[PDB]
């Protein structure tokens, strides 16, 4: 069963589109997820966040980091009209800075705080 590491991995990495990759990466094939960011830069770029820039979590935790850049990423949002089993996104491309969670050794992301 998977870490926490690779539950991130699999949600969020991806080196329409948001119907597709939901499905794909086991999002949506027993509940339709309201919202999901898919990264597309490298993992090890998206690894190498959590050693730049110490930011506090939504929910106040001081384990969370911004990255210096901004990087690729696709969002997908469900609309009004999505219901199980026919969920539907929103795909929306935007280049944004990405604020993750980490824990563990080694330090890698465990979840997505936000992106800016």
Known sequence: ????????????????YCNQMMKSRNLTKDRCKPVNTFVHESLADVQAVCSQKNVACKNGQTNCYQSYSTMSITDCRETGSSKYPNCAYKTTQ???????????????????????
Do not use: L, W
């Open 1 to 16: 069963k998977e870490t926490a590491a690779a539950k991130f991995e699999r949600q969020h990495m991806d080196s329409n």
């Open 94 to 116: 935007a280049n944004k800075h990405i604020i993750v969670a980490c824990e563990g050794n080694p330090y890698v992301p465990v979840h997505f705080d936000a992106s800016v």
